[PDB]
Amino acid sequence: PTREDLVATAKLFIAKYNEFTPESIISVRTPNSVSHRLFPTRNATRNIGESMEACANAKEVFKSLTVSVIDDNDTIVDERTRKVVFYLASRGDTIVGEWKSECIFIFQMSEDGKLVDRIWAGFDTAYMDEFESRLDGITF
Amino acid sequence: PTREDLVATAKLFIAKYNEFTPESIISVRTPNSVSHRLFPTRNATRNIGESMEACANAKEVFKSLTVSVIDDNDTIVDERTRKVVFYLASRGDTIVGEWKSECIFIFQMSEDGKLVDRIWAGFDTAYMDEFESRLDGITF
Ligand SMILES: C=C1C[C@H]2[C@]3(C)CCC(=O)C(C)(C)[C@H]3C(=O)[C@@H](O)[C@]2(C)[C@H]2C(=O)O[C@](C)(C(=O)OC)C(=O)[C@]12C
Numbered sequence A, B: 001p002t003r004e005d006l007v008a009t010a011k012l013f014i015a016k017y018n019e020f021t022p023e024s025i026i027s028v029r030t031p032n033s034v035s036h037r038l039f040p041t042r043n044a045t046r047n048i049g050e051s052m053e054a055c056a057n058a059k060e061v062f063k064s065l066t067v068s069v070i071d072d073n074d075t076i077v078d079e080r081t082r083k084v085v086f087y088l089a090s091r092g093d094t095i096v097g098e099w100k101s102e103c104i105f106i107f108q109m110s111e112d113g114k115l116v117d118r119i120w121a122g123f124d125t126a127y128m129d130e131f132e133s134r135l136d137g138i139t140f
């Protein structure tokens, strides 16, 4: 797979991700793929089923959620390990208000480069905690 | 610069980084290089001058600092853009006890690949807030 092949699979992952359904967030992933969170305070590993359940839970809070690659100049491609690094803006609307953040996504593509075989996501964990505090504060 | 050229210059950056003096932390950098700290809650851009001053200040709290590549097999190298990505365990000895965390470092090498021309660092920002909380507790 070419450099352009690896990015294109990664862009496709993003496009389907932004549909924000359990179906779409798995449709560019190999069924054995895992999704790792970076940084000890938030480390977690999700197989496909756990990702679908995470997405469904997230839709109970987020009314919209879109990510986008801020700048293709910053994108990192390792043709030998079939890895792509994106730095993304995430924007969303939630029952506890606005979500606005940035994160770094790392993809390892399958041997044919057509699917995502592994994901590493690094979030602004302090922002995550703060968002979770808004959630913890629900009252009626 | 070969894939191995790029990695060696980044390993040397790491080595001088662990020496942790205002001089060592710039010895592997170009004179115009900038360091960016990722994520909105800790965004920052530092030229060589500000980096030395930040390191000197940080030496008032960190007595010793070791960043280590967790796994050479996870390293990402982009020969076309001259970028190396490390996922690193960080281990500090500080005036309020141990620092234990993880970070991702992105180096962009100079054209000849002997120096570091640009740096992005992604830290566990919730842990930074918790460490700064530990400092707020120094009490005598
Ligand atoms: C060596 C450091 C210290 C570094 C540090 C204080 C090290 C301990 C940490 O893990 C935390 C996350 C607290 C670090 C930062 O806050 C970094 O932000 C800091 C201050 C480094 C920095 O920002 O700039 C240097 C030059 C760097 O490594 O950028 C390449 C850089 O050299 C800095 C100044």
Ligand SMILES: [Ca+2]
Binding pocket: A132, A133, A136
């Ligand atoms: Ca909670």
Ligand SMILES: [Ca+2]
Binding pocket: B132, B133, B136
């Ligand atoms: Ca404080």
